From a paper:
NoVs recognize specific glycan ligands as host attachment factors or receptors for infection. In this study, we solved the P protein crystal structures of a GII.11 porNoV (VA34) that was isolated from pig caecum contents in 1997 in Japan and a close-related GII.3 huNoV (TV24) that was isolated in 1977 in the USA, representing one of the earliest huNoV isolates, focusing on their HBSs compared with the previously known ones.
To this end, five oligosaccharides, including A type 1 trisaccharide, A tetrasaccharide (referred as A-tetra, Santa Cruz Biotechnology sc-285031), B trisaccharide (Sigma-B1422), H disaccharide (Sigma-F7012), and H type 2 trisaccharide (Sigma-F7297, see Materials and methods for their sequences) were co-crystallized with the TV24 P protein. However, only the electron density map of the A-tetra, the only tested tetrasaccharide, was found clearly on the TV24 P protein that was solved to 2.5 Å resolution (Figure 3(D and E)). All four saccharide rings are modelled clearly, indicating the HBS at the conventional location like those of other GII NoVs, on the outmost surface of the viral capsid (Figure 3(D and E)). Besides, R452 forms Van der Waals interaction with the methyl group at position 6 of the Fuc ring. While this Fuc-binding site appears to be highly conserved among most GII NoVs, we noted that, unlike R452 in TV24 HBS, most other GII huNoV HBSs show an aromatic residue (Y, H or F) at this position forming Van der Waals interaction with the Fuc via their aromatic ring. A strong H bond with K363 (about 2.54 Å), and four water-bridged ones with A359, H360, E361, and S449 were found, making K363 particularly important for the A-tetra binding, but this appears not the case in other GII huNoV HBSs. Particularly, Glc forms two direct H bonds to R452 and another one with a water molecule, stabilizing the TV24-A-tetra complex.
Author numbering:
A (entry chain D): 223 to 294, 308 to 538
B (entry chain C), D (entry chain A): 224 to 293, 308 to 538
C (entry chain B): 222 to 294, 308 to 538
Write the structure that this text describes.
Amino acid sequence: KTKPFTLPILTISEMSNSRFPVPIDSLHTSPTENIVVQCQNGRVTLDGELMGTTQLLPSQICAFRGTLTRSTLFNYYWHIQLDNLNGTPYDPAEDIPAPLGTPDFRGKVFGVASQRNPDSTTRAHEAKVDTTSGRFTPKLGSLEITTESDDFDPNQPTKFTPVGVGVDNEAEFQQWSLPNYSGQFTHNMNLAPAVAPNFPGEQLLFFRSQLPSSGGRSNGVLDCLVPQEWVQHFYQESAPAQTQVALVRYVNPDTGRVLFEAKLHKLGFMTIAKNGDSPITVPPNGYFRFESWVNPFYTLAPM
Amino acid sequence: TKPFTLPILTISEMSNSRFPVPIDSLHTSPTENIVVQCQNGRVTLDGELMGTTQLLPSQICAFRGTLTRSLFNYYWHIQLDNLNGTPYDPAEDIPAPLGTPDFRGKVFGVASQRNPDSTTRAHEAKVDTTSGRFTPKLGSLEITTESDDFDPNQPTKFTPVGVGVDNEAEFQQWSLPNYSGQFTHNMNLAPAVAPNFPGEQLLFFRSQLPSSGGRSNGVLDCLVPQEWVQHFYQESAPAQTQVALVRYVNPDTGRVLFEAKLHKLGFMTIAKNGDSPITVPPNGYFRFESWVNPFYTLAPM
Amino acid sequence: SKTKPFTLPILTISEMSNSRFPVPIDSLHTSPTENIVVQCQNGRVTLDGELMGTTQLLPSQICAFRGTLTRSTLFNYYWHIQLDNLNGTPYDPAEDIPAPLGTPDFRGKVFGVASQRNPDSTTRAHEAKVDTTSGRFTPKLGSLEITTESDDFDPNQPTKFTPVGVGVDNEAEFQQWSLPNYSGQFTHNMNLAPAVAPNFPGEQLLFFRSQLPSSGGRSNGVLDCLVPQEWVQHFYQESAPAQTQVALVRYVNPDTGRVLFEAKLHKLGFMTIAKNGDSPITVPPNGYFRFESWVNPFYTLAPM
Amino acid sequence: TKPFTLPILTISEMSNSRFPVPIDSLHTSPTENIVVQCQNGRVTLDGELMGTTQLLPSQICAFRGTLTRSLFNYYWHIQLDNLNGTPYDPAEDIPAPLGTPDFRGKVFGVASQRNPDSTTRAHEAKVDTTSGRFTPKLGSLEITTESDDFDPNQPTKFTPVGVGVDNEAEFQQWSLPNYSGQFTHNMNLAPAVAPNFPGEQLLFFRSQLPSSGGRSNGVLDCLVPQEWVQHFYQESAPAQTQVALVRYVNPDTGRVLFEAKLHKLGFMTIAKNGDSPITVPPNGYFRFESWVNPFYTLAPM
Ligand SMILES: CC(=O)N[C@H]1[C@@H](O[C@H]2[C@@H](O)[C@@H](CO)O[C@@H](O[C@H]3[C@H](O)[C@@H](O)[C@@H](O)O[C@@H]3CO)[C@@H]2O[C@@H]2O[C@@H](C)[C@@H](O)[C@@H](O)[C@@H]2O)O[C@H](CO)[C@H](O)[C@@H]1O
Ligand SMILES: CC(=O)N[C@H]1[C@@H](O[C@H]2[C@@H](O)[C@@H](CO)O[C@@H](O[C@H]3[C@H](O)[C@@H](O)[C@@H](O)O[C@@H]3CO)[C@@H]2O[C@@H]2O[C@@H](C)[C@@H](O)[C@@H](O)[C@@H]2O)O[C@H](CO)[C@H](O)[C@@H]1O
Ligand SMILES: CC(=O)N[C@H]1[C@@H](O[C@H]2[C@@H](O)[C@@H](CO)O[C@@H](O[C@H]3[C@H](O)[C@@H](O)[C@@H](O)O[C@@H]3CO)[C@@H]2O[C@@H]2O[C@@H](C)[C@@H](O)[C@@H](O)[C@@H]2O)O[C@H](CO)[C@H](O)[C@@H]1O
Ligand SMILES: CC(=O)N[C@H]1[C@@H](O[C@H]2[C@@H](O)[C@@H](CO)O[C@@H](O[C@H]3[C@H](O)[C@@H](O)[C@@H](O)O[C@@H]3CO)[C@@H]2O[C@@H]2O[C@@H](C)[C@@H](O)[C@@H](O)[C@@H]2O)O[C@H](CO)[C@H](O)[C@@H]1O
């Protein structure tokens, strides 16, 4: 009678990052006591409630849509009046931190800005979005893009396709530092809650990708709490969470053996019994399998 | 015994299965003068992938491999791997590496590299799927770039963005490229589809891709959204008949706006004549009614 | 080789416009103001031609706006307005002004008409109200909320607002000397033009007063501006150097030739007179203000 | 002798002199098929007001007076006062009360009242300048309203907002109304104007007025911005010749963009052929050069 909780059957190479439109590259764990893990994309509860700036379309994370105008080697600056991701007009009064899909990290997003005018003429060129700029105010409804080309028409529909990071100094990319969605004017609000292991000996487990970089030595490391397919899956199923913690096992269908076990928390993140920064090597055909709802005081087997 | 289901998705919550973009609209058109045989976004209702179709929405018209050398004046040779990094085998029974573009034209995007020493580069790139150097079935294709800042023998990725044709007629979404060039003809193709009932036309999930120049409409039609590709692969529910009856319902008013056939090979038809968009309200969604037979007469739209 | 002389335009009272609303001036008025803080932001100009607050030159754009209309998330329909600059430029909150130029500088409900013209040339216009006390009145952040009786508005279409008068239900909701919160409750008012007051014994502010139309109720529509809009425009054009902090002006009758009274025009752009009590200042139809001389601020005005 | 000057104003700092709205653009057109004889915004270079032109920017197409009774289907009679509240004298040598509309159509606005007991009303109203009851020269006109909430015999003001025509052809900005209705013809008109040099057309200060319905472009052209009306009235500089030479200058580049004639009767001409906007940078302004004669040959635009 109770709708059962499930996970989609996917290997590591069949999963997508929920903070950027790229495939998942690996599984990774590291200590996070020094940091506040409060990303806003890829935030979903196990019973299907989206949080933060999270939405369903994989391609739309860190993308935007709106109208370009002239503002007040990447020298050309442009003002973007943002619409909603689905084309509907944007209202700053909605109780989200920023338009859905807005980047949730400090740095420069490298991508391509494109335009299609009513007379059917089109143009597209490389563009960057400085999420640390004082004119990055997507919650207010606008942001600034930088371009190398001057081939852009004002008052024309503009789209931005995210590709990767485009910071000059590698330290400009801080994946766990939220931008100021209202610039200097207001604080961030309506945020999805921060996450941390509530248990001795446990660390967060990440679905990790290495984003493309347009220059420099940036590793492009972007960790999401849960892949986008699970966001989409939990939203569809909305199965009741019987406890705060679902027990999950990573299994190898060839050998039939459990490689490790982990906690999948109701708030939408994973923990594992392991210490220290390290990748988690999995077989190509392995997948995560839901074992049972469990009490939060369950002790995971170490790695 | 596993029932067939559709995910509950709005028009604005669907992704094109032939390009990593959202669906913009629903469209119908007569198709007797075109061959509808795209190879991405090809799935049967019981969850079998066909053509070059794979699961990752970002990897459609993307590639992965190694770059070597020889106004987008700079030409580069790309030795293709599989999207999962494993080496591509031209002997497998697919038309080309999974996610290879299935239309003639120039795919506009960004090529990027990350070297073992951690140095990186990314610049605009075009993939001409009509060039004789476009032989992804043989394991290689060619890109053109405007920037010369690329390192040979380095891991290279391609992020698709849109179309980049100079002449608008270069983009032909219903003409498959030659996956092996002029060395041989295409093989292992997902079958072509057509309406097979009087007064019926295909129903398309339409996107308008970005265009880097010119007047190209960038129109790209797919047979089912990528989310249905992913959902049918997961569910693998047995197809009880050749045709599923599906209805589009407005949850605000409770009313059915139109009905359609969802065919086992993974495409939809409606009772409609003429090239036309299908205007649907923002909260509408497709509902699976039941399995029927091909002789069902749909209500005209 | 002399400096540019300071001048006033020659205008009677029935030839002047309010600088806080697009209406003519009805009368001159004086009133004690030690109770209140006089800090309006429209119609603020220095005598040497510097605009302050939200003051701009176009008389019709005071309390007007333009932007893109959006549906919100009896005047019972609510709409969101993404505000542009009055010239179609996107509004920059980083500019050192309290709010977009022309933004209303008082608490209450501005009554007017909102209109739209679509790219397909279709048009609409209907009555609308701007509640400057609503928590969604955040023009400094680039948006505000209008309310309408009609539902005939298209979202995501270019929209203008023409101000007409006040539209409060209860008369006490209109407080001309209370500034709105230009960012709502989210941050403080910034870059305000300074407050004004007579810093001389026996002196009170002199106002150019209009009675705005009202859409209902018993509101007197009284709106006092420090300086008429024609002087805002004139001082900006002339930018004559201010020799002292006080210019002595006299209201003269060209028929009789006699001086009716004298007043101080202060450099910050306001006027004082030697008078006490709330009272209108009756003037002849042909009378006008005449610049007499720069004076030291301790000059003593003749009473009345 | 007082020299002639223009105020230093940007295009976005000028007001229409025929309606209380900002100037939207500059515009030129051949005008041999129209009569350019507006009555608001009429001033000579030496400061003489003409037609129905007055100083208050908010009072153009406004009125003041006393209302009585006679889908905007409520009709009301307005006994007109002067804009300064003084009674209107039809005997004066003006075409109509100052500020009276100078085009055929329906002026859309808001009529408001304030009673001696301080009760107030305001609702949408229209002034049809083509109606037989539009006789402002005789001292009265007629409004229509949607609301019935109006008290007879009370002081009534009209605030113009834009046009309110149902058919778009009813708005004829170059057709003067009959200020006395059918009783007699218009009198005391400001003179009509026309270019008088080969290749020269009038240059208009153009606004696009709000429209309460339909597809009317709301285009309203004035010969001179209201600020120039106010400036020349203040200055009253002697017009040394019939024509002033004026140039449009960009301060961001120092370059002159075009030159024009400013004629003594208060209108401008340029060397241009066709109906066209005049694109100007945001910081440009008109600069008075000197007095010339009507035989000057402007450089083509
Ligand atoms: C993020 C971005 O838009 N980058 C641009 C930009 O990258 C070059 C500049 O960032 C430049 C600043 O000094 O540094 C270049 O690299 C140095 C490197 O830091 C040194 O350690 C040494 O190797 O000399 C290099 C000379 O370039 C940046 O070049 C980029 O990064 C390098 C690590 C390498 O991968 C190179 O191929 C990259 O181009 O400007 C370049 C154009 O010159 C690109 O437009 C890039 O996107
Ligand atoms: C696909 C691609 O890489 N396009 C480039 C390239 O586009 C320009 C060329 O296609 C060029 C050939 O002469 O024509 C330009 O547009 C003309 C158009 O053909 C005329 O009909 C008329 O409209 O003048 C236009 C001036 O550009 C192409 O420009 C691009 O397309 C236009 C329709 C317009 O949208 C413009 O903004 C575009 O840039 O070269 C340009 C660089 O100049 C771009 O690099 C573009 O990506
Ligand atoms: C500002 C606004 O939107 N006004 C509307 C609104 O006005 C009427 C309501 O505000 C109503 C609320 O009770 O009160 C009315 O006047 C009452 C008055 O309060 C009573 O003391 C008594 O005198 O009865 C009156 C009604 O006959 C408001 O009416 C308006 O104000 C009156 C003094 C008078 O001037 C009348 O003509 C006005 O309409 O709602 C009305 C709807 O009829 C209008 O839409 C008005 O603009
Ligand atoms: C000038 C005025 O008072 N206008 C009113 C009035 O306008 C509507 C009527 O004029 C009506 C006559 O049938 O036509 C409407 O628009 C049609 C349009 O003619 C058709 O071509 C098609 O587009 O369908 C439209 C449906 O409205 C007029 O509506 C107004 O003009 C339209 C172009 C559109 O912009 C609409 O939003 C406007 O309201 O009546 C309406 C109320 O019904 C208003 O009161 C308007 O001010």
